[PDB]
Amino acid sequence: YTRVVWCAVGPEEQKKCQQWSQQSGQNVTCATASTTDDCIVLVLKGEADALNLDGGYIYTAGKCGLVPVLAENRKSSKHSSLDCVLRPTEGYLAVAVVKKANEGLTWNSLKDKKSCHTAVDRTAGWNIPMGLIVNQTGSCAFDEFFSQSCAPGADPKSRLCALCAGDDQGLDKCVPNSKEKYYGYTGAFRCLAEDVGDVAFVKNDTVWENTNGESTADWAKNLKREDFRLLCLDGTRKPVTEAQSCHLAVAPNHAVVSRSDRAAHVEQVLLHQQALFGKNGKNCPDKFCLFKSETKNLLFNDNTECLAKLGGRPTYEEYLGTEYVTAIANLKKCSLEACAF
Numbered sequence: 001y002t003r004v005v006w007c008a009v010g011p012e013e014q015k016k017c018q019q020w021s022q023q024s025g026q027n028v029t030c031a032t033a034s035t036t037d038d039c040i041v042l043v044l045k046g047e048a049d050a051l052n053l054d055g056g057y058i059y060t061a062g063k064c065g066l067v068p069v070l071a072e073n074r075k076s077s078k079h080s081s082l083d084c085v086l087r088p089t090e091g092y093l094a095v096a097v098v099k100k101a102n103e104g105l106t107w108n109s110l111k112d113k114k115s116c117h118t119a120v121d122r123t124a125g126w127n128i129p130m131g132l133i134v135n136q137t138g139s140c141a142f143d144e145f146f147s148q149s150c151a152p153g154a155d156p157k158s159r160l161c162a163l164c165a166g167d168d169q170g171l172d173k174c175v176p177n178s179k180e181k182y183y184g185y186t187g188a189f190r191c192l193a194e195d196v197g198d199v200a201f202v203k204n205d206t207v208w209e210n211t212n213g214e215s216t217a218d219w220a221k222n223l224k225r226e227d228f229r230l231l232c233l234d235g236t237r238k239p240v241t242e243a244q245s246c247h248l249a250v251a252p253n254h255a256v257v258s259r260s261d262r263a264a265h266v267e268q269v270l271l272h273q274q275a276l277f278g279k280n281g282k283n284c285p286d287k288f289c290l291f292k293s294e295t296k297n298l299l300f301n302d303n304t305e306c307l308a309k310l311g312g313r314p315t316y317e318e319y320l321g322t323e324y325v326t327a328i329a330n331l332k333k334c335s336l337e338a339c340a341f
């Protein structure tokens with residue numbers, strides 16, 4: 001009865017999920033959809049139990065009644081006493097990244113430039129940067145700010161998708177799943193690396209994890225951190241080592257969400273699954289590692305140490321934080337208290 005149906009977004013996550021299922025002895029099975037929004041709908045219908053989501057999607061899911069269950073917790077340095085599962089999350093740093101060689105480009109000269117976003121509706125790749133831009137320009141025409149962009153999830157024929165590349169066949173251009181070459185943290189950063197875009201809206205960790213040999217992938221294996229710069233809100237440019245004083249915002253960690261009535265069961269199963277396939281899991285790396293997918297961040301971000309319990313049994317609003325929730329609310333007024341489905 002404690003069989004948990006995970007929802008994989010796209011064929012690559014589906015593949016990983018199938019392996020997880022096999023190894024879990026069917027304690028976890030898989031449902032697959034083409035987009036995160038579609039997965040959310042599968043959960044709402046009760047045809048899937050849960051999935052890990054970025055804060056922007058948590059907002060969508062929460063408005064529809066879904067709740068936070070456990071949050072991704074990466075490596076920390078503070079509070080090192082507590083066990084990962086009980087350690088409070090620290091959130092991640094949303095940043096705007098450019099090539100150092102692209103001299104003179106600052107936060108204040110982004111207009112008409114080319115941009116790379118993780119996907120529409122995501123925290124670092126969309127909600128934070130576009131919310132800030134809309135705000136500063138006093139215009140809801142965020143589709144006319146950048147000359148061209150790759151913002152997975154937007155209209156494929158629009159300029160917001162002009163830079164997306166689709167899959168190895170050139171198909172699925174701009175789809176919001178790993179099939180799109182420039183999808184997600186890694187895809188958006190690659191979009192910048194290959195100079196397809198002038199700026200990439202990702203998180204701090206993405207830059208470090210795909211530079212100086214941290215990634216063996218063909219497009220990243222030869223990337224050096226010193227060739228990149230972060231754009232601070234005061235118009236200055238800083239080395240990627242100064243993210244703490246040069247970010248667009250602190251984002252709430254991605255987290256697992258499920259229907260309220262399945263929360264308890266999903267939590268129980270996951271806590272047990274990571275004991276087996278997590279960071280120091282009994283069967284990882286020997287049999288299967290839930291938090292690995294060769295930098296592709298499938299199902300979970302690859303830098304996840306463990307899924308941690310949430311203190312205070314927070315509502316989706318409490319988990320995201322009132323400020324972030326309000327920021328999203330305001331941005332969405334551009335394109336009010338009900339489920340978008």
Ligand SMILES: CCCCCCCCCCC[C@@H](O)CC(=O)N[C@H]1[C@@H](OP(=O)(O)O)O[C@H](CO)[C@@H](O)[C@@H]1OC(=O)C[C@H](O)CCCCCCCCCCC
Nearest residue numbers: 086088089091249250252309310311312314318319321322
């Ligand atoms: C522009 C950027 C500026 C920089 C800002 C810096 C902050 C960014 C961090 C992300 C924000 C988010 O984490 C805030 C948050 O979560 N707040 C708690 C709070 O909600 P608010 O809406 O913010 O009032 O109030 C709620 C109650 O009043 C409380 O529940 C909320 O949520 C939490 O605190 C959730 C937990 O912290 C989840 C993490 C695990 C911590 C506990 C350890 C586990 C042990 C539990 C054992 C059962």
Ligand SMILES: *[C@@H]1O[C@H](CO)[C@@H](O[C@@H]2O[C@H](CO)[C@@H](O[C@@H]3O[C@H](CO)[C@@H](O)[C@H](O)[C@@H]3O)[C@H](O)[C@H]2NC(C)=O)[C@H](O)[C@H]1NC(C)=O
Nearest residue numbers: 127128129130131132135322323324326327328329330331
């Ligand atoms: C874009 O600009 C809008 C408009 O200012 C921002 O929304 C505003 O956000 C602030 C801060 O979150 C809200 O202020 C208040 O917060 C305090 C708690 O500190 C609370 O006590 C007050 O009641 C109030 O909510 C302000 O209300 C809110 N304005 C509106 C109309 O909701 C938004 O944050 C900006 N977006 C980004 C990404 O910065």
Ligand SMILES: *[C@@H]1O[C@H](CO)[C@@H](O[C@@H]2O[C@H](CO)[C@@H](O)[C@H](O)[C@H]2NC(C)=O)[C@H](O)[C@H]1NC(C)=O
Nearest residue numbers: 075076077093204205208209214242243244303
């Ligand atoms: C930005 O993210 C990077 C990558 O996650 C962080 O670098 C890691 O820092 C941790 C300690 O916090 C070390 O355990 C790792 O060795 C680092 N990884 C790499 C590849 O360098 C960095 O600390 C983060 N910076 C900020 C400001 O949060």
Ligand SMILES: *[C@@H]1O[C@H](CO)[C@@H](O)[C@H](O)[C@H]1NC(C)=O
Nearest residue numbers: 002023024025027272273276
């Ligand atoms: C599957 O879940 C059952 C239920 O308790 C548990 O006994 C078993 O150890 C689990 N097996 C795996 C490999 O997940």
Ligand SMILES: [Fe+3]
Nearest residue numbers: 054055123124
């Ligand atoms: Fe995110």
Ligand SMILES: [Zn+2]
Nearest residue numbers: 247248249250
């Ligand atoms: Zn800050």
Ligand SMILES: [Zn+2]
Nearest residue numbers: 313314315318
């Ligand atoms: Zn509460």
